[PDB]
Symmetry: D2
Subunit: 319 residues, 4 copies
């Protein structure tokens, strides 16, 4: 069991960006820029910084050339600069390794803290970031499958209850969960920003990053991504969907990048900001909890997930 610190939890606003290590920067760029249409905030020969259509912070996704494909950091923006200090004290009290860089770990981000959390994931907490042009009204750049915001991460861990209690201490609230008859949690969705989730815990060998998710405005935008991928003859990279999720009620699509990092395109969440928001508990045997339409969920979806790195860049041991 992970103890609850005496130190006050940092006030987390929302998931902000993920930093993924990719093996071939040009193939990855072709997938994220030419196929998916994300907007390049900055790039050089080692890294590409991308942002979604409505974002005003520097980026939502950093692709870093690296020898082994993996999740290098999942970042959450905190409410004030002092929350970075709170995060540092908080994770130190939990006995976790932390690394603080006043100048940031990646471009566009200022004072930041990366930690190897209790579940083995590399989390970053930061407030400062360079504001860039919000492209929300740049309809001259709007693509038929435009990704408008980064919505959430989904982590794979062996002990979901244990991770659940840890994130609830951190301030995340469960919006929906999957439980057995005994009341044991099998998976949980938790938020800070007011949508169904900023992150989620799914049971399995971990630590591993299951996917990063972006949303679109409407359902036809998701359908265009599938049509485009079939026209580019890469439909084999469509893993699951499109479909309607039971948990979260979102219309979804799961596709795979060149390094097999899973990306989810999502839309039509509901508001969960009130403090007594009614948690929705689905039974582990309910066939409509994952796919509302009852579609069989691909085997690989449960088995394949991305490796994550510790703070020295080594791959975390999978349990």
């Amino acid at each position: 069991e992970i103890p609850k610190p005496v130190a006050p939890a940092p006030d987390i606003l929302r998931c902000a960006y993920a930093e993924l290590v990719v093996t071939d920067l040009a193939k990855s760029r072709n997938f994220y820029v030419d196929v998916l249409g994300l907007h390049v905030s900055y790039e050089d020969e080692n890294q590409i910084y991308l942002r979604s259509f409505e974002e005003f912070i520097h980026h939502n996704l950093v692709l870093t050339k690296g020898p082994v494909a993996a999740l290098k950091a999942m970042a959450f923006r905190v409410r004030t600069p002092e929350d970075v200090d709170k995060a540092e004290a908080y994770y130190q009290e939990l006995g976790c390794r932390t690394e603080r860089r006043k100048d940031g770990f990646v471009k566009g981000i200022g004072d930041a803290l990366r930690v190897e959390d209790p579940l083995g994931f590399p989390y970053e907490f930061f407030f400062e970031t360079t504001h860039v042009e919000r492209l929300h009204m740049r309809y001259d750049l709007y693509s038929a499958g435009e990704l408008v915001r980064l919505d959430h991460f989904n982590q794979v861990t062996p002990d979901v209850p244990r991770g659940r209690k840890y994130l609830e201490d951190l301030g995340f609230r469960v919006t929906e969960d999957i439980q057995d008859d005994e009341g044991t949690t099998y998976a949980a969705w938790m938020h800070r920003k007011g949508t169904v989730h900023d992150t989620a815990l799914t049971g399995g060998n971990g630590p591993r990053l299951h996917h990063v998710a972006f949303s679109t405005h409407e359902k036809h935008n998701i359908i265009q991504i599938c049509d485009k991928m079939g026209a580019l003859r890469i439909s084999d990279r469509i893993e699951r969907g499109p479909g309607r999720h039971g948990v979260s009620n979102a219309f979804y699509l799961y596709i795979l990048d060149p390094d097999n990092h899973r990306i989810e395109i999502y839309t039509q969440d509901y508001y969960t900001g009130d403090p007594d928001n009614p948690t929705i508990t689905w039974n582990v045997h309910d066939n409509q909890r994952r796919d509302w339409w009852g579609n069989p969920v691909v085997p690989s979806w449960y088995t394949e997930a991305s490796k994550v790195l510790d703070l020295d860049g080594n791959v975390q041991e999978i349990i």
Copy 2:
């Protein structure tokens, strides 16, 4: 090989309606009316006459109570009254069994000819029909998953090449087909009205009705049908889809009625009205020919199909 008659072929306009036999009229009404939203032109304790949102003839679907679930007739409307005379002459020269009725076989239809065509299917040709209120601007009745037109039929036959030649002599033009390296047709789509098809031949044990298809205005209308079915907990009746077809380029969904008759909901076809319309031939090994996004094709979709009746009301023998 079916021979080409000397008598001129009747001018076929488009598929017009199908008469299906169902076993429990109340269960069927609940499906076609309460779930799918088709509009009742007329009904009594033995039959229900249904039309789509934009239709102006009496109906596109007749549900007839009967002992065994089956297709009792697939009807095509012809251009002029005299065309019913032509179809009669034509099918007699092919030595087919034909039954004529100046007063029709079902309400709403006038002088009609039914026949057991060469492939064993019960085709009806008619011109006269009672006009009813075209509901195309009845937005107060417009449902979120509204079916707006009857689009086509799809027949299962053991010898597609044979079937194809016959339908081509009848005036249908092939828009798309699937062939092997030897130039052998495994499936063909053919039209009269200017969309990709009015009917189609898929290979297998026949004669059997593979499905009847209706269209919607937009893609989200099809997604709504799935969502609605998941909410009524009958998602086990969603057979295949939704998806984008390779052949026809349509967005589609296949669902099963209470008697397992298969209904397809389809949208966004292209214009095939020009005489030199480019035929599109797909290779039997192209994984994108059926489902453009590469989705696995459900087994039942290839093996299950509805039985058809002869003019005496008996189930045609399957070959």
Copy 3:
């Protein structure tokens, strides 16, 4: 200038419901339930309590039969039961008349505070409310023009800069505003929940309620409301739109109910939850600020708005 109280402001979550007085309950029920499709949580011969599709609190709109059509209260839910006491102390320090009912002023709301705020508006603050069945996955009830959430109110007041400061002291953050060359604010949008706004101030004779807005999932849903009204032959009740707003970037529509209360249907907002969300200031002479497509602005839109009631039930005098 309204002074900033020493008392802490209440923690406001979001706009929650409005209570409108209507003159003919049957006519209003026809407009809100039959035309618009809102869901009845409760109703008797004197009031109708309605909620949107994804709502879980008791209602988003209360129709109260009364002599003069007017806004009786615009309500905001606060984070904790204690925030109601903070709101009471806060408004008293401001010198406003306040009325506290531990049992609510309408059904489904518990301990609440109503006040005649500094601008003449009847605001209510409450935390307790009866939870009802969240219909977010009831696709069997989903209509083609489904209103899914209550989003914001828009208030008419003579002095925007004066009201803007008071609302900012209350904790609302300005997301977009319209200003002239001298930097004077002509209209402002402000929020608590993370969308562009929970309320907004537009300059004009007041206090008056300009409109209440609900949102839909997608753009076609707003188009359907227009189509259905044309089919019901009440297209004259369509006042402005549909269009794309410049400020807020939302797709919108304004319609008038039987008593001329204006309802806005809106969709496609962006996230404003970060504390340094960049404010977008539009110039008073930019022609795309109101309607991005440059459509002409209907004159009634600027002059007509609803009267508001003081706590005794009399129409507030308009300045």
Copy 4:
């Protein structure tokens, strides 16, 4: 009154393309290609040949550089090469100037006949045309406001009844019209291809071209065109709409190109292919006949329209 020829009328398939004369080829290219996204089949310094997404014939629109903007030709494709001959005999019997070119008047078109029809319009009839790659499944190219088909032309002429008769003898069928109490036609919509119209007559000083129309798959694509124009700051070129037409029931938008030629973007028509398709007659006083939502019809819409050229290249005198 125009007499009915003895010679048989040519079998017209559908409107196929328009040749417009533009004063600045670069500006026109910018509008038609960069803003609207039409596809270039061929271009040089004097002309640009464009086609819609689903077209297979060489082009749907030809932009021809010239001193005075005007419509040089509105072309209809015929069913067989012989129909071109019938066309020539037919118009010659009507006493109209004709000009035949076995090699076509523009690239990609074969044996064609241009004439100065009875109303002063430069019509063209042709069968042969170079086929080009049909882009209907090129989703890699699909834009958010993709124009998919050329649908119709709309002509301005002083005597509508006079022209209606001549077009009906030509084989066009009236699907909808506007009449007064005396039964006098003020406007008519007529087709060949099975949609609401291939051409239409609106009373006014003529001959003049009112607009050429392209369609989109869904309503949101039309909305994107407006949004994009807003972003490019050319919203002043949006003339009327978006809206829902009463006549035709189509969702529409009218925009102006660099030389004021009017383009209509439109979607969701209904099938008019049956010979006894009910004609819908709208009363001249029905306020929903043009705009179903009852929106004011811009004055310019009624007064401005493009000049037409005679076979010599001179502007036809306007009556």
